[PDB]
């Protein structure tokens, strides 16, 4: 038969700047969301590109379960997602990068923020979407801070032979 045998398809994917950017005196930031694609006679459709980038945004922009404190939390905002009780991979959804607290000098706090960011995006390798991830954070002053996230991908069809590691499963998204 035809060599195009991989029948797996791709569903909707959140995209950066889907709903434009919100501007303010401090600066300009994107407003991620779903994207609508129009035909020549209506018949709108949702975009499905950049799967891994869409997955990364979901992990970062979601509050995970909060640690116990001894005083408690209101039932409304204990964090997490109620659907995590059915999954079987023994993990929890969301990220905990917003739960840091001002400790010591700003240098210490920033270092902690980086630690949480790595600890959350590490889930990408566990699912098998990407073979490696690393974040580089640079401190330059009081108000200017930057953070770049590097995600490694792979091609759809195996081309190299003799890899030390393993071919990541769920690579049919080829990214």
């Amino acid at each position: 038969n035809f060599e195009t045998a991989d029948r797996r398809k791709r569903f909707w994917t959140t995209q950066v700047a889907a709903c434009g950017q919100s501007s303010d005196d401090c600066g300009d930031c994107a407003r991620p969301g779903l994207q609508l694609l129009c035909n020549g006679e209506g018949r709108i459709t949702i975009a499905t590109d950049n799967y891994v980038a869409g997955l990364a945004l979901n992990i970062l922009l979601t509050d995970a379960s909060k640690a116990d404190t001894g005083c408690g939390w209101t039932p409304g905002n204990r964090g997490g997602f109620w659907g995590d009780s059915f999954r079987s991979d023994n993990m929890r959804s969301g990220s905990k990068i917003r739960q840091v607290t001002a400790r010591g000098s700003m240098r210490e706090t920033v270092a902690l923020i980086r630690a949480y960011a790595i600890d959350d995006l590490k889930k990408l390798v566990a699912y098998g979407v990407a073979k490696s991830v690393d974040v580089d954070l640079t401190y330059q002053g009081s108000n200017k801070i930057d953070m770049t996230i590097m995600i490694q991908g792979v091609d759809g069809n195996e081309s190299r032979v003799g890899l030390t590691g393993e071919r990541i499963a769920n690579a049919w998204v080829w990214s």
């Binding site: 930031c29 990068i97 607290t101 081309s159």
Partner: protein, 496 residues
Amino acid sequence: ALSDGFVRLCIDPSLNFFGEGCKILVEGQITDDATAAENVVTCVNSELDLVERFGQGSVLTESLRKVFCMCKSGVSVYALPRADAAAAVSAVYTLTVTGTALTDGRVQLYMGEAEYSLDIGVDEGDTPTQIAAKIVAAISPDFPYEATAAAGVITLTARNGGTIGNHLSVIYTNLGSCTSVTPEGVTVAFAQTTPGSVNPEPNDYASVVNECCFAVYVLSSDDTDWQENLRDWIRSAWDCSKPQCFGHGYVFNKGTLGQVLADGDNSAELSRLALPTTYPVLPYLTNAAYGALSACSTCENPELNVQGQTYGLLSCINMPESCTPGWEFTEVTQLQNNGFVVSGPATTSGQGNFTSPYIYNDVTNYLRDEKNRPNATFRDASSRRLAAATGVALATFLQQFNGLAVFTKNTNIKTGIIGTNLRLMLGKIRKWASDNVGVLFSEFDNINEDIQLVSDFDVQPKCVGQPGVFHLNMRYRPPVRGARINVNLVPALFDN
């Protein structure tokens, strides 16, 4: 960022691409349908913009398609469209079909590149040539040649004028003894009728690429005069009369051995690719593939050689293997000794089965030297990349002395002063050069003599120098590539 949250608020990178820093420029012809303005550098985004922005089946579109197919991410692309000459003539090819099909079968072609192949099944026995020549309805639109489907013959006319349309050789599957889906009694004849006439000769690089840095230049043309102009521009970018915009260019030369060797004008700024007269793939596609692969898609490390079957594999190109190697081994050695680049198949099956090409040596066109002595200082393309990297890195390091008090007459620095003198400056630089051994330099032959620092007061005569100007002279060697070892094999019969 409102009605919720805590410390660590987010602001996101509206743009998803951040691999800026390395750029590639593609130059070639276009067609009338193109909406892009001529002689104006423009940024290319993805494959969607093509066709509309640069015409259907134009030379530029084909080159760009291969570039994107090799460099999926990590490099920014640029295009510089050019228009056809005033009196250009388009080449014409003829492909006549003869005989009447009398058994059910299938006809399939291979022209120019694998992406343009086709496969159509003959309707039934007793279908004459007129019902045949339906191939035209199957030829893909992207093919740079236009098919007319005349009565009994199909004519191919180049969509771009000039000499760029004088390269074809067809591999074909009728009259063969393979009755696997072949129609019996059908044959095809291939011939040429009109060649190309005139190519453009733009000479305004100083205006359209003025003070803009580009890592790699790719040229999809075979006009020697056009290539000569590109070399001159690169020299200026490497010139000493102003701040430099380091870059490199890729070109190709096609013909017999005698013709190809005649184009070796000792240009250290170009990497000329040599091809035979019967190359079964369109020329400019292979050149674009080589340029894109080396256009920092692989060469973010300046010292990485693009050779071998692991790094120098032009995977995007597929072509059947011919009955002869094309470049006889006695000719391969000569080309490599004259500063050319030679490519060949990456797998050993010389039958007609599809393979891919790879590059033997990553070598520029550098020979001899200023004056007339021979040397190999810039023999390897990596040397040019490393030389540029060293200049930028060294310039950054010396920035720390900008605006620092310097003592030259009385060398005793008072207590509490922030300054330095010549010897301390030299020591710091000497430390930096020695530290980079194994990253940008090899072991210095004599580190005590290859670095010198002299204040301008010690060079100019009395009352002519300026205060606070130095002359630094450094000599270095790039990392060693290989070595030669003599082996004397000697078995011994005596036991002691």
